[PDB]
A and B are shown apart, each in its own frame.
Chain A
Amino acid sequence: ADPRLGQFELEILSMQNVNGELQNGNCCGGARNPGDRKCTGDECNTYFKVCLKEYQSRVRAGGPCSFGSGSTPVIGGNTFNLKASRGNDRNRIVLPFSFAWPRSYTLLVEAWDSSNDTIQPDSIIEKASHSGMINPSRQWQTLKQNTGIAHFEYRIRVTCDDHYYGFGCNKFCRPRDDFFGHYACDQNGNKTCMEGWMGPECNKAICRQGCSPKHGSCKLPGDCRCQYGWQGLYCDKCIPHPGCVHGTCNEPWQCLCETNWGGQLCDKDLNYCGTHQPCLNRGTCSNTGPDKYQCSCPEGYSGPNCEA
């Protein structure tokens, strides 16, 4: 189990209590000075309880911590500053939530003196109540309770879990690079296509530049697959009929003969005379048939090539 969209985070920064007295006005396990009413004795054993609940216009004295609760162990005496403590999470409380963050909340922070014996309960040092609104963000908000005699300071923020975005940690975006898509997720959970892809799902390959729109397609970026009867880098060149030797095409399977070439396959020399100079002894040639010739010989010469 344990699903979660995010967590409310609170850390106790500092606590100040020169006197060392409960909110009763009595000393934390100490006796009163006869003069100047000073507390003499051991300091408070300060720990914190936290209660996070639905935002309420009128803060209630009762009711459950609907968004969760937690508490620290004893983290200091009467006065201590933890703002510079790095790597210590004892002063840290994390409340995970599996609902869309409402953004309105009511929060209760309490400092308590840890009892000195088994028989006595604890007694509260100072109690704080704060209602407000907070957006998911990695930046902290510092709050200070400084109305009473003891004062403390703490910080809060709401963090979405991975693949969650928006004010409610409710918008999803999980990057992928497979058949069904090729994208990353930006800050706002919008999809940003990987290079070479396009479309809302980033699953439509961007073909080779100049690839024929009509006769070319690509299943992979930078490629150009030609429809039947087309060829070339851009798939913009027709394929002549198979067996077409000296011909070209304007549409597939055509065979349009070059100069002085004939036959459906353009494999028949129409100028065998000019091509081979077959006649001899000044005999004059005639392209009598495709791939065929006949010589007219000068007087005294006979034969197809005019040899005496």
Chain B
Amino acid sequence: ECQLMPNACQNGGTCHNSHGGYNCVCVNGWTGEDCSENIDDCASAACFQGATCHDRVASFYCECPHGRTGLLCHLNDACISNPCNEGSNCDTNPVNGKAICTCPSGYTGPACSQDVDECALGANPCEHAGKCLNTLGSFECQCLQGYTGPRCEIDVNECISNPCQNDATCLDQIGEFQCICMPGYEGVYCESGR
């Protein structure tokens, strides 16, 4: 039978064991006795205008130049003109070639060229009655005096500069300090003796 040959009619080819000789009926796209040679669909393909064509089984792949995309690379991709802002990944639709922007954090809109107002989301990120300030693609906290850090969470230690004098104890208070003078001293900074 055809059993003696492990492989005859290689690609979707059905062996026929006729008395005169073996025969192969083959799936479309192949040709030859065993149907081992791929019909060139690129000689008749619709890949055009600089596309590198690659033969597939009853199909073809249009390798596209950079300024084009699609099944046939028949349309230009809008991502070549950089419609999306920096930080946004530009992707191309396979059907129409229109650019699809994926915005980074802080930006929105079709072109991702619009700031998000983080101060207009229903919450104040700033502690201690701080004022949310909107920044292009970001936000900031306008802290009160005595509070710093990105969210106004750190009490400034105004006693860090040692403003009190003559071994006075300095009191770290909100936005100011207070000196407590040793015996025999006076003044806001305990600077005047006796």
| A interface residue numbers (CB < 8 A to B) | 3, 54-55, 58, 60, 63, 66, 98-100, 102, 168, 170, 172-174, 176, 178-181, 227-229, 241-242, 252-253, 257, 259-260, 262-264, 266, 268, 270-274, 284-290, 292
Contact = CB atoms under 8 A, between A and B. Distances in A.
Nearest to A189: B153
10 contacts: A180-B123, A227-B91, A227-B102, A242-B94, A257-B59, A262-B29, A262-B59, A270-B57, A271-B27, A284-B25
A270 B28 contact: yes
A4 to B, nearest CB: 10
Interface of B: 12, 14, 25-29, 56-60, 71, 89, 91, 94-95, 100, 102, 118, 121-123, 125, 127-128, 153-155, 157, 169, 171-174, 178, 180, 183
**Residue of A3, A174, A253 most packed against chain B (CB within 10 A):** A253
Contact of B123 (A178, A268, A270): A178
Contacts, number: 101
A255 B171 CA distance: 73
Contacts of B125: 180-181
Main secondary structure of the interface of A (DSSP, over half): loop
A174 B60 CA distance: 62
A263 B155 contact: no
A99 B178 contact: yes
Given A179-B123, A257-B57, A271-B12, A228 B100 contact: yes
Contact of A227 (B89, B118, B122): B89
Contacts of A176: 123
Given A60-B183, A253-B94, A260 B12 contact: yes
Nearest to B26: A287
A3 B174 contact: yes
A285 B14 CA distance: 11
B172 A170 contact: yes
A264 B72 CA distance: 9
Given A270-B58, A271-B27, A264 B172 contact: no
A289 B127 CA distance: 74
A163 to B, nearest CB: 9
A174 B180 contact: no
Contact of A264 (B71, B100, B157): B71
Contacts of A292: 28
A66 B60 CA distance: 90
A274 B14 CA distance: 10
A99 B59 contact: no
A268 B59 CA distance: 10
Contact of B153 (A58, A99, A172): A172
A54 B28 CA distance: 99
Nearest to B167: A57
B89 A270 contact: no
Given A264-B59, A270-B29, A270-B57, A98 B173 contact: yes
Contacts of A172: 127-128, 153-155
B126 to A, nearest CB: 9
Give me the 7 closest cross-chain CB pairs, A-B, nearest first. Answer: A262-B58, A287-B28, A253-B94, A100-B172, A99-B171, A180-B125, A270-B28
